[PDB]
Amino acid sequence: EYKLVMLGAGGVGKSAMTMQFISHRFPEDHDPTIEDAYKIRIRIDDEPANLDILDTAGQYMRAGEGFIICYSITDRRSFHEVREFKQLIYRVRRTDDTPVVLVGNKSDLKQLRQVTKEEGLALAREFSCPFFETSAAYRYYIDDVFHALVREIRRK
Numbered sequence: 001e002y003k004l005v006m007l008g009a010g011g012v013g014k015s016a017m018t019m020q021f022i023s024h025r026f027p028e029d030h031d032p033t034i035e036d037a038y039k040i041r042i043r044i045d046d047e048p049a050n051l052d053i054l055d056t057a058g059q060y061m062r063a064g065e066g067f068i069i070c071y072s073i074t075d076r077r078s079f080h081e082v083r084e085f086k087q088l089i090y091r092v093r094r095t096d097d098t099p100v101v102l103v104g105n106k107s108d109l110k111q112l113r114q115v116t117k118e119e120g121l122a123l124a125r126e127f128s129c130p131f132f133e134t135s136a137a138y139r140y141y142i143d144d145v146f147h148a149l150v151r152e153i154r155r156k
């Protein structure tokens with residue numbers, strides 16, 4: 001039983017992601033102030049588990065064992081902001097190497113990318129971190145992210 005925290009600028013898809021993950025549903029635009037927390041049972045490689053995800057609105061962060069930091073490939077400011085999210089996990093859980101998974105959401109808005117995939121991969125080498133592009137819109141790559149976060153909780 002593992003508690004994970006989604007971190008990210010407003011509007012990048014933390015919510016659409018968490019909900020595509022937990023119940024295979026996209027919310028087109030969801031009350032943005034609602035920081036939800038969603039307990040679910042899943043099965044990871046199988047060795048199967050329970051995760052309590054805090055979906056943040058961009059202090060249950062003392063107790064958080066894992067972070068998904070999220071940006072939108074369409075929004076460089078969101079991406080630069082992953083670096084403030086970074087030094088928050090550190091001021092808080094307190095080292096240089098918490099379990100962390102870096103994600104660029106909205107990969108489906110490819111005509112509108114302001115952020116390259118090698119940029120994301122290079123921020124991920126900073127954290128030493130797995131890195132993913134997802135589209136929550138189309139549930140693309142969404143399981144992989146949460147399952148990799150789980151494998152860094154347990155590899156640490």
Ligand SMILES: Nc1nc2c(ncn2[C@@H]2O[C@H](COP(=O)(O)OP(=O)(O)O)[C@@H](O)[C@H]2O)c(=O)[nH]1
Nearest residue numbers: 010011012013014015016028029106135136137
């Ligand atoms: N095209 C597209 N839109 C998305 C995706 N994920 C989220 N959105 C849209 O982006 C907005 C914010 O989603 P949301 O999950 O609520 O962002 P949050 O503020 O991080 O929690 C809404 O207008 C969503 O429909 C995506 O993968 N693709």
Ligand SMILES: [Mg+2]
Nearest residue numbers: 014015030032
């Ligand atoms: Mg939200």
